[PDB]
A and B are shown apart, each in its own frame.
Chain A
Amino acid sequence: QVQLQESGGGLVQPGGSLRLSCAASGKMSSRRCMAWFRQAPGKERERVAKLLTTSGSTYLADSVKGRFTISQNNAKSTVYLQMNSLKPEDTAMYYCAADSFEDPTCTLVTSSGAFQYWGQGTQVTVS
């Protein structure tokens, strides 16, 4: 079934940028609901972005609206998080997650517990 593998993490100064990628494979219906989550140490995984792959409909958490963008490539084997104007509070391990949820559920479900498929995570540090 579905496999997810992140790349793109690193360290930036404030104002800097990183681009994360999530290489996604497996039955497309099983991964139509794509998301980016982040976890700071001492905190729970929190969702920051959502994409329904079939409609292209996206959603960004208030904390990152206007700074981050979620997108996919033509083959839809890769999902991106473009992270501009990074701030120290964005420091976290970032995970891509996938599941089969159609909209509106895909948009509205922010709990990490809902999603069955996960990447291994990539570190983003802003200092």
Chain B
Amino acid sequence: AFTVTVPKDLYVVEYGSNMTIECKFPVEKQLDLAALIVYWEMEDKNIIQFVHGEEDLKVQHSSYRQRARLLKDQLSLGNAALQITDVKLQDAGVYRCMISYGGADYKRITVKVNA
């Protein structure tokens, strides 16, 4: 069945640095955007919804809205990569990626932040 994997389930990061966390999923020879959904959250708070080849436009000022982005050029290589810049103490916690691309699955990644 469709399985999402992580190269690391824990990242330890320094305050003020930049961090990229990754989930991996099965590739086709051609990235079919119509079928792909990429969902990133921290705890239950949504960070990314990449649907139909489009990022869901957020209007609410939030912690993540200007510092978080999905590295879209990595999707065709089977990498869901979330880059968060200028890491803050509040960025510590449990992240989850859910990818749907035919089947669907999810994994969790913990981030610890040092100051």
Contacts of B98 in A (CB 8 A): 99, 101, 105, 109, 114
- Please state if B104 and A105 are interface contacts (CB–CB under 8 Å): no
Contacts of A32 in B (CB 8 A): 44
The interface size of chain A toward B, counting residues with CB under 8 Å, comes to: 17
- A-contact bits for B87-107, CB 8 A (1 contact / 0 none): 000000000001010111110
- For window 18-57 of B, CB contacts with A under 8 Å fall at 37, 39, 41, 43-46, 49, 51, 56
Cβ of B59 within 8 Å of any chain A Cβ, yes or no, is: no
- For window 96-110 of A, CB contacts with B under 8 Å fall at 99-102, 104-105, 108-109
Given A101-B98, A114-B98: A30 and B104 interface contact (C-beta under 8 Å):
no
- Please state if B100 and A29 are interface contacts (CB–CB under 8 Å): no
Given A29-B44, A111-B100, A113-B2: A101 and B39 interface contact (C-beta under 8 Å):
yes
- Please state if B104 and A116 are interface contacts (CB–CB under 8 Å): no
Contacts of A30 in B (CB 8 A): 44
Interface size class of B (residues with CB under 8 A): 10 to 19
- Please state if A108 and B37 are interface contacts (CB–CB under 8 Å): yes
Cβ of B1 within 8 Å of any chain A Cβ, yes or no, is: yes
Q: Tell me the smallest distance from the CB of B43 to a CB of chain A, in Å.
A: 8
Cβ of A76 within 8 Å of any chain B Cβ, yes or no, is: no
| Bound form: Cα–Cα A27–B44 in Å | 10
In the complex, besides A104-B49, A111-B103, A114-B98, 10 extra interface pairs with C-beta distance below 8 angstroms are A27-B44, A99-B98, A102-B46, A105-B39, A109-B37, A113-B2, A113-B104, A114-B100, A114-B106, A116-B106
